[PDB]
Amino acid sequence: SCRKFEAPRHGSLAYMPRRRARSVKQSIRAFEKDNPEDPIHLTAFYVYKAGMTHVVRNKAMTIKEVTESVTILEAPPMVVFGIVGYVNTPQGLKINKTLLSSHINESVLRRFYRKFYLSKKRMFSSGQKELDADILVLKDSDVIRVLAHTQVEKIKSIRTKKAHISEIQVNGGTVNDKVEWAVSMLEREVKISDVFSTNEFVDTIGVTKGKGFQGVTKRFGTRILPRKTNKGRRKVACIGAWHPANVLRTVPRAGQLGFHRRTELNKLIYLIGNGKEE
Amino acid sequence: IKEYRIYGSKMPTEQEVAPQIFFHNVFAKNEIVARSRFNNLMKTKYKIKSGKIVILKIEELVEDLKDMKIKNYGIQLVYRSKKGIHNMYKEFRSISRCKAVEMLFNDMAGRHKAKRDDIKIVSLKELRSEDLRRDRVIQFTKDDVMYPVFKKVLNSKYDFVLKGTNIFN
Amino acid sequence: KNFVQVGRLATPRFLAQRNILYVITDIQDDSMVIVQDAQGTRKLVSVKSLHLMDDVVEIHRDMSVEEVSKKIPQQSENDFERFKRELRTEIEEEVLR
Amino acid sequence: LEGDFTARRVVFLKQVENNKALCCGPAPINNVPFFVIDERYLLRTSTVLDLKEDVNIDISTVFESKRGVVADRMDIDANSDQKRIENAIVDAVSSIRFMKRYLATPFKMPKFKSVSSLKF
Amino acid sequence: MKRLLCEEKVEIPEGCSVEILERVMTVRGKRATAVRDLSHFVLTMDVHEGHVRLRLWNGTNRERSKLITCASVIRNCIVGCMSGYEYTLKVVYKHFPMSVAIEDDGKTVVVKNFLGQKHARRYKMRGDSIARLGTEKDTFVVEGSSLEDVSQSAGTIQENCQVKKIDSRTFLDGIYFLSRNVVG
Amino acid sequence: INKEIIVDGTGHIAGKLGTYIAKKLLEGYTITVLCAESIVLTGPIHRTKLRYKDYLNKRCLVNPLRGPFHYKEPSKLFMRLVKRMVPYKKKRGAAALQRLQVFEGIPEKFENTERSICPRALLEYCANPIRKSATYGKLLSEFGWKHLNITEEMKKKVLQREEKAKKEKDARMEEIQRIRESSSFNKEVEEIMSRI
Amino acid sequence: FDPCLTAIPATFISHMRGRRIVHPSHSLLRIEGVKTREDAKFFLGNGVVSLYELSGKKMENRGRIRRLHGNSGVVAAKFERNLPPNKIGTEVFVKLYKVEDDDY
RNA sequence: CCCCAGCUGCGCACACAGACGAAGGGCGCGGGCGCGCCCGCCCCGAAAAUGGACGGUGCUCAGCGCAGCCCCGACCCCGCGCACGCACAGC
RNA sequence: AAGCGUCCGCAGCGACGCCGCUUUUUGAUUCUUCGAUGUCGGCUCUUCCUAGCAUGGCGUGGCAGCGCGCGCCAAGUGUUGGA
RNA sequence: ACGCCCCGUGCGUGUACGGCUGGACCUCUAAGCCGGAGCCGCCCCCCCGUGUGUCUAAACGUUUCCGCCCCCCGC
Ligand SMILES: Nc1ncnc2c1ncn2[C@@H]1O[C@H](COP(=O)(O)O)[C@@H](O)[C@H]1O
Ligand SMILES: [Mg+2]
Ligand SMILES: [Mg+2]
Ligand SMILES: [Mg+2]
Ligand SMILES: [Mg+2]
Ligand SMILES: [Mg+2]
């Protein structure tokens, strides 16, 4: 029969199944819409979370002083070392041509090894006579992305020399000029100030803090059962009706909480600065 | 189907040596339905039931289709629906009388779901073009009528063929 | 666009029976039509069962069977003859080299 | 159709006892010796040669080709009357223009379109 | 009733050429040239003897009704591509003066202060249609080369600028059709 | 026997094409269906959309990960049609389904191939022109298949290359015909038959 | 010797069956090019062979086209050994000579 | 088509219809009778709870009707052989 | 559709009657279960239906506005704290 | 968490419905067309598993680094 008092569902079904993320680095699943009248620019960057503080800012409406929590994302410049071109196929997007630089350093080829200290470092032994043929087929692409890696050794607090590699879409005009910019930027660093600016909204993609196997009260916020409850209070009591004779996937069960991929929209950049300058 | 003229009478006895001879013109599938449609009319017009009927003659009325033109036929019929019994008058153009009633049966079945046994024909008269009452059959009585074929029809039995092959023409 | 009219030549719609000529002698309705064979026999057929040829023959509504059959235009293989046929193309492809 | 030779145009001579048939596609022309097979395995074609000679030959030693076995028989023999009646159908094949190529060529199936096309 | 043949022809006047291939029609008139697709009709379209002929064989009353609309849509496309249509619209208001104004060279009409509303109702013009103010004030006229794009462009304004959610008997303000006629 | 058929899907009624496809598949034919975005569903489009929304509504409430899967491509939706015209749970029907490959448009693997049609399943043969109809790509482009325009553009570039090669090939059929009719060729031919 | 040189290939499409009950002694064949019942009358009584391999060794299972089947030129054949349902969809070769019901 | 076996013709219907239904209705279409009736098809009336059932696929000539010729299909019937029973040229 | 509704059968109602639907009531029955299917309510938690309460779009009024009534489409999101 | 931040807009089919043109004298309808719902579908977001692209490797089944991975060790 009908439940006596109605209430919203505990937790979103949009994020169920709550599984662990497949990686710690998340690739951009969707870049912004490429506008040919826009100038050539990159669309993403890869930063590292340093910590939080709060700023005080004047909120003009009369002026009222407000304080707001901010968070500081350390962004060493990313080195562009490859180009990936895509074509619009009736099955979707397809790799048209991958063009790498002749130089791949010890940081970014640490990523290609599981145990690097025991390795022989022979990845990417790799001709420059085929560049113009590879640039020409790359000009036939529909979507141009650069292969950029992070410079994780520049942080030095993270005991990680192994770099994070990702594709960043080159948005601008006339795919000819996209790869002419991209071959210019091979083995060059891209600053965070070149990609973003202050008071603009960005989307952050990352993996949450892992909480391990958690019960339903933390995982979903279901009500703790009363004090008299035999066999446990931090539960959902009825996990399903008699029919259907299975448990639905919509019922909150105990499992993995945290270490999920999350994309948060419209995070405003308050300040872009350098950690050395005051 | 076929047309039958079935002659019959009461079986002659010592009391009635020459009974009155009757005949019925039936459009039937065969002679056994034609005997059956004759026996009901002797049972219901007169009171002669089928045990006391002798069927004197059954002949197939067949037309000579020597030069085979199309005649017009006006058919007065009585058909029984699920709801009642009604009179209808239908006009057809056909080859023979026995083909025109086949056009009657396929039309009453298509338009009214009247089965062949649910239909009794009052009269079938071959008509002039001037005496036709249906304007649809009048259109084809005009000389020099012409129309094209717009339905596609295949020129063989095919399961799969290449694209270039003509199949309709 | 070939029309169904009296005097329009026709053949059976099947390709294996295209050797037979018909001529439309009378029109019943949208769908049925009397055709006359070159052998003089007439039969009522469907319009869908015919493939209309391009030619129309000078026939009017009430003509005799002999009168229409005057105006209809006039219309096997062995293994050895098939061999002689296939050998002809056998050499014909060799000359083109 | 089913013999040692099994796609070879030959000519038919005589029907023999126990359901057999004497045949010789002439050994100069198509390299086929005298043989007897079953009567049914001969697919009949419409063309007949004009052979007037008597075909009552000394069949006692002729190589009989069975159905499935492709057993390699011994080569050609003395051929007392076989040489004469072979030359009579080489005489018959010379009168007709392309018939020499016909008996030499192995049989190919006609491209099927109907069973009327399978008349032979 | 299934007549054996229903036929009507549309007399192509002098100065325009009509070309019909596989039930699409290209008219080349003085005012504009429009290419019209009539393949939703099941008809034989041919232009012969200077009048486009539509013929229907053994057609039902449903089909020959569609014969006539194909004839009237060809009549309208011809004199739209020859003369051109224009629709006249009267702006009616009791209390608040509506101000209609054209932008984008007559490709859009703004309507402001409709019933004292702040929201500016813009209405775009479906292709090859031009709006301008009426020579009489409190009127604007939309004019173009096809009756459907003219009467829909005017028709959206007559549909959207009525008064809804307040009583339409007491509130009579809105834009209405006055007169519908061809150019000249 | 050449038991490999390449079907062009334009102008075909879907379930009527699928019966002749599945009956061939169970007899050992390997069928490939091209241009599956143009396979036709008869009737007006709104009835066909309600049939699709009825399909989308059916899912496992307990676990839709194992529910009735809903296909937005015309190729996988047409594959789903022929899937149940064979006995696919048995090994004879699943083996037959491995001989289907259904594609939208013409991929360049199928450039210059020889495409077939099922004329008993054609829309111009079966349907009345009074009746409405709609293709798969007309339906499914409003149900999440985003690739209608890129299919038709790449379809056109294949058909223009094939029309180009047909313009070259039939000219070679023209000149070979004009050569084989020439009296120089004939007396060359009767000279060889003289020597045989 | 190729089978397609002298014999017409026919695809083994089904056994003779009901909707459910299957009688495997009679195999239904579809001869190529044969599309009508009167066309298949040319092949009544004709021998038929199904060629297969057992441990790489070639075998001939011989049969006779026994009766017609349907209106579409499908014929029913009875072989020495019944055809397995594995071979449904594969080809068997129809001979051009008649054989008898006793003697294949 | 699953699934053995279909073709030739003539009609009719468009409603996610055929594929549960009433009273009462429908300038919906097709026939018929004297604007009103009648007959077919369709429509409205016609709303249930896991997602889902003309059996499914699907079908708009795979629906609703008819005709012609054909085909498939039981251990039935027929014929033959064998087993067993009988009072046994057989049943 | 008798009547009511200022006049006005149908804006909205609607008697006297009649036709249905539903299985959310209770019976009727006794088909399943008596070598047992744990019997009310609540708490908890999920889902579904629409005969739609709110929220979205509308049509209608005996709708001036404000409001209220009647009807339509739509089951997305909601539908509380207490004696 | 009792604290703080983000959940923003869009696009499309098209419901009811309003319209346009327009037939069988009007007519939103029979053909066609326009607009149109918190619905529906995309987009976004999350998950899945299959693919795509790139990189890389010696000897004579054994030697063994020839390419590596895994355990072990630490965090
Ligand atoms: N009953 C009909 N009367 C007139 N034209 C028709 C009819 N049926 C089809 N058509 C037209 O015939 C053409 C298609 O015929 P087809 O030559 O078969 O492609 C199209 O222009 C149709 O509109
Ligand atoms: Mg307790
Ligand atoms: Mg079958
Ligand atoms: Mg018995
Ligand atoms: Mg128990
Ligand atoms: Mg229990």
Residues 29-48/C with CB within 7 Å of nucleic chain H are 29-32, 46-48
**Following CA atoms F110, F112, F113, F119 in sequence, which dihedral angle do they give, to the nearest 10 degrees?**
100
List the structure tokens of B133: 């009452």
**B5: region left, alpha or beta (phi > 0 left; psi from -120 to 50 alpha):** beta
How many Å apart are CA E106 and CA E109, to the nearest integer?
7
Which residue is closest to D3 within chain G, CA to CA?
G1
CB B51 within 8 A of CB B10: no
Contact check, Cβ <8 Å, D40/G97: yes
Measured between CB atoms, which of D105, D114, D117 is closest to C83? D105
Output the CA D113–ligand 4 centroid distance in Å: 46
CB G38 within 8 A of CB G31: no
Tell whether the torsion through CA atoms of C26, C32, C38 and C42 is positive or negative: negative
Output the CA A215–ligand 2 centroid distance in Å: 21
How many Å apart are CA E144 and CA E124, to the nearest integer?
13
- Report the candidate in F143, F127, F129 with the shortest Cα–Cα distance to residue F14: F127
Output the CA F22–ligand 3 centroid distance in Å: 11
How many Å apart are CA D7 and CA D25, to the nearest integer?
11
List the structure tokens of D72: 């390699």
Q: Please state, as a whole number, how many other Cβ atoms lie within 10 Å of the Cβ of residue C44.
A: 17
Chain A neighbours (≥3 Cβ pairs under 8 A) are F
Ligand 1 contact via E68 beta carbon (within 6 Å): no
Contact check, Cβ <8 Å, C51/B155: yes
**C15 in reach of chain F (CB within 8 A):** no
How many Å apart are CA G96 and CA G9, to the nearest integer?
11
Residue F193 CB contacts under 8 Å (≥ 6 apart), including other chains? C87, C88, C91, D98
Element (H, E) at A203: strand A201-207
Q: Please state, as a whole number, how many other Cβ atoms lie within 10 Å of the Cβ of residue F13.
A: 21
- Report the candidate in B93, B97, B89 with the shortest Cα–Cα distance to residue B122: B89
Q: Which of residues 67-106 of D touch G (CB under 8 A)?
A: 68, 70, 106
List the structure tokens of C82: 């098939």
B-C Cβ pairs (cutoff 8 Å, strict): 66
Point out the nucleotide closest to F57 (alpha carbon to C1′). H51
Q: Let me know how many helices (H) and strands (E) chain F has, helices first.
A: 8, 6
CB A273 within 8 A of CB A191: no
Q: Which residues of F22-55 are buried (b: 16+ CB within 10 A; e: fewer)?
A: bebbbbbbebbbbbbbbbbbbeeeeebbeebeee
Measured between CB atoms, which of C3, C14, C16 is closest to B146? C3
- Report the candidate in F23, A132, D65 with the shortest Cα–Cα distance to residue G88: F23
How many Å apart are CA D94 and CA F60, to the nearest integer?
82
Going from the C-alpha of F13 to that of each of B161, D66, D82, F140, F147, the distances in angstroms are 16, 54, 67, 16, 21
CA of F143 to C1' of J40 (A): 9
Residues 39-78/E with CB within 7 Å of nucleic chain J are 40-41, 61-62, 64-66, 68-69, 72-73, 76
3-state secondary structure chain B: CEEEEEEEEECCCCCCCCCCEEEEEEEECCHHHHHHHHHHHHHHCCCCCHHHEEEEEEEEECCCCCCCCCEEEEEEEEEECCCCEEEEEEEEEECCHHHHHHHHHHHHHHHHCCCHHHEEEEEEEEECCCCCCCHHHHCCCCCCCCEECCCCCCCCCCCCEECCCCCCC
A17 upstream amide cis, omega within 30 of 0: yes
Q: Which residues of E76-113 are buried (b: 16+ CB within 10 A; e: fewer)?
A: bbbbbbbbbbbbbbbbebeeeebebebeeebbebebbb
Output the CA F17–ligand 1 centroid distance in Å: 24
- Quickly tell me which residue has 């040319």 as its tokens: G42
Which residue is closest to E5 within chain C, CA to CA?
C30
Contact check, Cβ <8 Å, G5/D70: no
List the structure tokens of A186: 């091979």
How many Å apart are CA B86 and CA B77, to the nearest integer?
9
Nearest 5°: phi and psi at F22?
-70, -35
CB A153 within 8 A of CB A136: no
Using alpha carbons only, give the angle C27, C33, C34 rounded to the nearest 5 degrees.
100
Locate the ligand 1 atom nearest the alpha carbon of residue E22 and give its number.
21
State the first-to-last Cα distance of chain B, in angstroms, to the nearest integer: 34
Q: Which residues of B49-65 are buried (b: 16+ CB within 10 A; e: fewer)?
A: eeeebebeebeeeeeee
| Resolution reading in Å | 2.9
How many Å apart are CA A166 and CA A195, to the nearest integer?
15
CB D108 within 8 A of CB D120: no
How many Å apart are CA D80 and CA E181, to the nearest integer?
112
Q: Please state, as a whole number, how many other Cβ atoms lie within 10 Å of the Cβ of residue A26.
A: 18
Which positions on chain H have an atom < 7 Å from some protein CB?
A: 1-12, 14-16, 29-33, 38-41, 50-52, 56-62, 64-68, 70-74
- Report the candidate in D86, D87, D82, D41 with the shortest Cα–Cα distance to residue D62: D82
Which residues on neighbouring strands pair with residue A56, listed in sequence order?
A67
Nearest residue to J42 via alpha carbon and C1': F144
Residue F146 CB in 7 A reach of strand J: yes
How many Å apart are CA D26 and CA D46, to the nearest integer?
18
Contact check, Cβ <8 Å, E1/B135: yes
Chain E neighbours (≥3 Cβ pairs under 8 A) are B, C, F
Contact check, Cβ <8 Å, C1/E44: yes
Residues 108-137/E with CB within 7 Å of nucleic chain J are none
Q: Which of residues 53-82 of C touch D (CB under 8 A)?
A: 76-80, 82
Q: What is the DSSP letter of F12?
A: B
- Quickly tell me which residue has 């080859």 as its tokens: B95
